[PDB]
């Protein structure tokens, strides 16, 4: 027995052991070198995952874990999200006087749970790893600890997330019963027709409860009411990390447990994803117009962009692959972490998250205003930025698959996203000496720590929101070669 295929997670558990050894020795005399060993644990995990690039899609453990190229790509996206989001809370912890230790532990183990959810193949790990990630999510959401609204919101999130996973796993139970006693996604579709339960009400209830649980994980418009309420009081770095990592690992599972054990009921499967996708694209982008908050309407924009991702979920590997879904998740990470980097910097310098405080950012800080405006135009997609070509590749694959009523609704709601994005860009460009707020006028860029890594990762996300729309052909060339998703 040797599972060498899970060496990038062996680097994660090695970093966790080093985290605990530093968290037992001195406990006070190491803030920055702990961040160093954690960030280099991320970089070593990434270079190990790149060293294991051309390996076979071998199910490594005892019918338990598959290192597909598709799963390797989604693990790479979770590592990239964690790398490009891990400097976004080196100022928040010292600003709010929390513990940087065990926060790095939470981020590392949420990354761990996401990377196991990508390669999970038994139905056990498609409950263990998502809710590994979700218990880490509840610990990351209940982390400010100064008020009543954040803790009540994360408690309601814990209720809804337990309900989410429990409906998902009740559907997994109907899988486990209707398909004999079989688990392992490759064996479950075998177990349905060994028991002659393909044309069964039990497998229909299995598919409906699984897709409701995944729609809770994907925050699609039936099961979407958590994200704005739970992204007010929960801190902006974990709003960023948890929203982006949750939705990339949930789209990982939403391909994984939907193509391999559900290619027989694919008609009702596509119809359920089409209903949740169209309602999500409409309602996320139609709530996000009318909110005076910044993280709430960002949560709804994330809902709308995941509703764009579901168009890539519905299309198969053939008539426009999942590669469009992959490169749009890469674009989504790249142009969403920059938006949240700018929202973090408005709050490491002001302290507020109200959207009406943005009037006058161009006069005070043209750099942060340029970065946020360019990230929002990437999210909307007017010039050739990344998100426009991501939505173009999505709508291309959906139009080539014939999904006309997906692509047209995605285009109308893309215009509807353009409205509230340029509603934001009105504020951080203009300013008229009383539309500016007293939370804005005293901006004070100079009382700052140093040349931070928030600015570095922010400008990396800005360049990664600008040029990979221009340079998309290597990304499509490296994404189309994921044909083993089956």
């Amino acid at each position: 027995f040797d599972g060498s295929f899970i060496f990038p997670e062996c680097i994660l558990i090695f970093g966790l052991i080093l985290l605990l050894m530093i968290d037992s020795t001195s406990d006070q005399k190491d803030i920055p070198w702990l961040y160093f060993i954690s960030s280099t644990s991320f970089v070593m995990s990434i270079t190990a995952l790149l060293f294991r690039w051309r390996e076979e899609p071998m199910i490594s453990f005892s019918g338990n874990f598959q290192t597909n190229n598709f799963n390797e790509i989604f693990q790479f996206l979770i590592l990239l999200c964690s790398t490009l989001c891990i400097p976004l809370s080196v100022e928040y912890i010292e600003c709010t006087e929390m513990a940087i230790t065990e926060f790095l532990l939470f981020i590392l183990t949420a990354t761990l749970g996401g990377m196991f959810l990508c390669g999970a193949n038994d139905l056990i790990t498609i409950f263990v790893a998502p809710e590994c990630f979700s218990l880490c999510s509840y610990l990351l959401s209940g982390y400010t600890k100064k008020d009543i609204r954040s803790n009540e919101a994360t408690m309601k999130y814990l209720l809804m997330g337990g309900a989410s996973s429990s409906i998902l796993v009740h559907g997994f139970s109907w899988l486990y019963g209707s398909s004999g006693g079989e688990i392992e996604l490759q064996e479950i579709v075998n177990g349905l027709i060994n028991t002659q339960m393909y044309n069964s009400p039990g497998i229909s209830i299995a598919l409906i409860f699984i897709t409701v649980g995944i729609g809770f994980k994907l925050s699609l418009a039936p099961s979407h009411q958590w994200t704005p309420d739970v992204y007010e009081d929960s801190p902006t770095p974990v709003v960023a990390f948890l929203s982006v990592t949750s939705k990339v690992a949930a789209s990982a599972s939403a391909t994984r447990i939907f193509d391999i054990p559900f290619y027989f009921s694919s008609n009702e499967w596509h119809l359920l994803l089409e209903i949740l996708a169209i309602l999500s694209m409409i309602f996320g982008n139609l709530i996000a117009i009318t909110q005076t908050s910044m993280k709430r309407m960002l949560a709804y924009s994330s809902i709308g962009q995941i509703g764009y991702v579901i168009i890539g979920i519905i299309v198969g590997d053939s008539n426009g692959g999942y590669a469009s879904m992959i490169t749009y998740m890469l674009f989504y990470i790249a142009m969403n972490l920059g938006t949240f980097a700018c929202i973090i910097l408005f709050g490491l310098r002001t302290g507020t998250d109200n959207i009406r405080d943005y009037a006058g950012l161009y006069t005070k800080d043209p750099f942060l205003a340029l970065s946020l405006a360019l990230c929002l135009l990437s999210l909307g997609g007017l010039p050739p930025l990344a998100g426009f070509f991501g939505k173009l590749h999505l709508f291309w694959c959906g139009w080539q698959a014939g999904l006309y009523f997906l692509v047209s609704i995605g285009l109308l709601t893309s215009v509807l996203s353009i409205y509230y994005y340029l509603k934001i860009i009105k504020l951080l460009m203009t300013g008229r000496n009383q539309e500016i707020t007293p939370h804005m006028r005293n901006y004070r860029i100079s009382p700052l720590r140093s040349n931070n890594s928030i600015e570095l990762s922010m400008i990396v996300c800005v360049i990664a929101s600008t040029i990979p729309g221009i340079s998309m052909n290597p990304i499509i060339a490296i994404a189309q070669d994921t044909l083993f998703s089956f």
Partner: protein, 497 residues
């Protein structure tokens, strides 16, 4: 040979990109830097034109292709038709005069002149592209910079008009995207995007009609076709002059360009299906927009609906399946580019002097500003389709394209000529009502205490320099028809068999 149109298009963006911070916190340095770049780009356009554009060959000149994405088969197809170089010269000329008129802006002139150069690149990228999808790239790359200009510079309710413009053009460019998705995917075997390869396909009528509607609802908002023209009295009427003279000069005429480029040589048979309806819609458009213009108390909105009225002759000349029809449409594109550019320029300067928007006030001002009065009068005559001016010969060749049509019979042609010729009665009504309101007359309170400054030499060069090609085409119309008649023959070869 040489990357001609690539270094045409990328030069205003990449050369305006040297305003990164550039610590000169007045408008002088970036002002003169951007008029320098626009002159250099105009000389690049003329040097590509006078020396490497053969005005005889009706094919793809200055042809160029790169690779961008292998999956879309999306290239950087650049090339000029005979129907394109008039619009490219109109683009360079009118936008260079727009940033000339954009000298005294001083609010955030760095970002302003940078987005001026961004529009000045994206428009030539739209006209120069021999690709559907790159035409869409540049069709929405001309959207966010002129939004940022419209909203932060010029107009009372400029925020509403800016958001209405950007949402209206985006919600139609999604239909343009539906059209290019349809043609590229379900066009034929081997899905391609080069228009050199694509204008020679079968396209049966139940598919070609859907393609044609997918592009006609796209282009029907940009050349304002009267079911879809609500964006324009807000967008043009509530902008200041230097952005609006390119909004009306060259931004209004793409789409009408695309109705010649995409909706006429790519989709000929469904254009022959719907040009009976587009002819009637253009004839209703001229009368409708010429009658909405006396209803506008506002000054600048009268010129906006005047632009909607003159686009009817372009829609009619496109729908006239003829060389005189299409050639008068190209002539009206260039002519009313000059006309709308100069009129919105002079309306912006008249608002800057007089500070009065409507026309119940702002009585006799011609004794106060006689230079603005005489240029606005002569350019009103250019708007009147009145001779020695290009609008005259434009509308008359459109009439000649109606009367020499093989598509239509006499029952239609009499009604079309009659309705269109009422439009050249309705156009003097609102134009001379504008002239007798804001210039003719005498106000007793305005004698010596105000003593308004007249047109300075800069604005007077703007007005004269737009007036001179209008006269030079109105007395010798082969400055437009001779550079495109070969290409219009190549177009109508597909229609007459």
């Amino acid at each position: 040979d040489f990357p001609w149109l690539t270094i045409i298009v990328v030069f205003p963006i990449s050369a305006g990109s040297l305003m990164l911070f550039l610590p000169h916190r007045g408008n002088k340095v970036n002002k003169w830097y951007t008029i320098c770049i626009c002159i250099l780009e105009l000389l690049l356009t003329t040097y590509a034109f006078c020396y490497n554009f053969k005005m005889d060959d009706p094919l793809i000149q200055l042809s160029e292709d790169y690779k961008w994405i292998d999956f879309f088969d999306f290239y950087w197809r650049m090339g000029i038709d005979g129907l394109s170089i008039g619009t490219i010269l109109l683009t360079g000329f009118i936008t260079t005069l727009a940033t000339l008129a954009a000298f005294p802006v001083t609010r955030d002139s760095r970002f302003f002149h940078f987005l001026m150069l961004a529009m000045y690149s994206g428009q030539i990228g739209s006209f120069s592209s021999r690709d559907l999808l790159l035409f869409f790239i540049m069709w929405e790359l001309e959207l966010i910079p002129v939004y940022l200009l419209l909203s932060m510079w010029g107009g009372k309710k400029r925020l509403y008009s800016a958001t209405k413009f950007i949402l209206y053009t985006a919600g139609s460019s999604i239909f343009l995207l539906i059209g290019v998705l349809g043609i590229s995917l379900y066009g034929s075997n081997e899905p391609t995007l080069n228009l050199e390869l694509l204008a020679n396909k079968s396209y049966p009528v139940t598919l070609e009609i859907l393609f044609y509607i997918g592009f006609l609802i796209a282009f029907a908002v940009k050349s304002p076709i009267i079911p879809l023209h609500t964006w324009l009295p807000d967008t043009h009427g509530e902008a200041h002059y230097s952005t609006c003279m390119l909004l009306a000069g060259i931004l209004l005429k793409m789409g009408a360009y695309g109705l010649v480029r995409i909706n006429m040589e790519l989709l000929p048979h469904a254009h022959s299906m719907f040009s009976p309806w587009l002819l009637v819609v253009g004839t209703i458009q001229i009368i409708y927009a010429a009658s909405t213009s006396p209803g506008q108390r506002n000054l600048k909105k009268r010129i906006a609906y005047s632009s909607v009225s003159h686009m009817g002759f372009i829609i009619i000349g496109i729908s006239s399946i003829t060389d005189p029809g299409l050639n008068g449409a190209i002539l009206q594109i260039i002519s009313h580019g000059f006309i709308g550019a100069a009129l919105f320029f002079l309306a912006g300067t008249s608002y800057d002097r007089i500070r009065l928007v409507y026309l119940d006030e702002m009585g006799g001002m011609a004794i106060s500003i006689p230079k603005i009065f005489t240029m606005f009068t002569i350019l009103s005559m250019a708007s009147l389709a009145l001779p020695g001016m290009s609008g005259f010969i434009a509308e008359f060749i459109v009439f000649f394209g109606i009367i020499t049509s093989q598509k239509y019979f006499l029952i239609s042609k009499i009604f079309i000529i009659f309705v269109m010729a009422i439009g050249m009665i309705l156009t003097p009504i609102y134009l001379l009502s504008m002239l007798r309101q804001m210039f003719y007359g005498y106000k007793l309170i305005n004698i010596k205490n105000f003593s308004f400054f007249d047109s300075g030499p800069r604005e007077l060069f703007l007005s004269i320099s737009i007036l001179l090609p209008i006269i030079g085409i109105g007395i010798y119309p082969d400055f437009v028809l001779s550079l495109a008649s070969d290409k219009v023959e190549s177009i109508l070869s597909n229609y007459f068999y």
